[PDB]
């Protein structure tokens, strides 16, 4: 299954280097800028790579919803995470001409009783989400737990 698509050559190369180091089989889709990898490893690998910093309405909505769902699924592969919800809020093509807008994301996680996300895991989530959405800076990702505690500084 596709690990990543639409990668820069630089990111692609970095991702391939990491996969080789981890001894994970991979197949870079020919001229598809995509890297199909073991289906059962896709989510774990996305997270791991994120930790190392790598890399119509209905459709949009659907797309957005699909993206949200995928991101949630990936985040749920983290050990301490029981469930995750991702909400993406990219304003519709800035109607206002002068004012400038920017995409943001809100991530809510339900943690396993007695478990917490560490700083690394938190950073991985933030990176994963930011990288998935064009123009979404890490700073515009808010990560909260079930109790509403802000995890991202």
């Amino acid at each position: 299954r596709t690990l990543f698509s639409n990668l820069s050559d630089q990111d692609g190369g970095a991702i391939v280097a990491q996969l080789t180091q981890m001894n994970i089989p991979y197949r870079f889709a020919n001229g598809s800028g995509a890297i199909e990898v073991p289906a059962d490893k896709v989510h774990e690998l996305r997270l791991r790579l994120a930790q190392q910093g790598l890399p119509q309405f209905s459709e949009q909505v659907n797309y957005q919803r699909a993206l949200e769902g995928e991101l949630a699924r990936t985040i749920e592969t983290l050990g301490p995470v029981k469930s995750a919800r991702v909400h993406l809020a990219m304003p519709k093509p800035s109607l206002f001409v002068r004012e400038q807008k920017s995409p943001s994301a809100s991530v809510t996680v339900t943690l396993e009783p007695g478990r917490a996300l560490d700083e690394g895991q938190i950073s991985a989530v933030v990176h994963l989400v930011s990288s998935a959405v064009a123009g979404l800076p890490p700073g515009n990702v808010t990560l909260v737990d079930q109790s509403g505690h802000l995890l991202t500084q």
Partner: peptide, 27 residues
């Protein structure tokens, strides 16, 4: 410039007060 920094400071304070209220009002 500085006004935007002050406004962001106010927004963060308001958001944290909101979250503190929500935390106890949730259970």
């Amino acid at each position: 410039d500085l006004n935007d920094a002050q406004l962001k400071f106010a927004n963060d304070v308001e958001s944290r007060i909101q979250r503190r209220i929500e935390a106890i009002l949730s259970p």
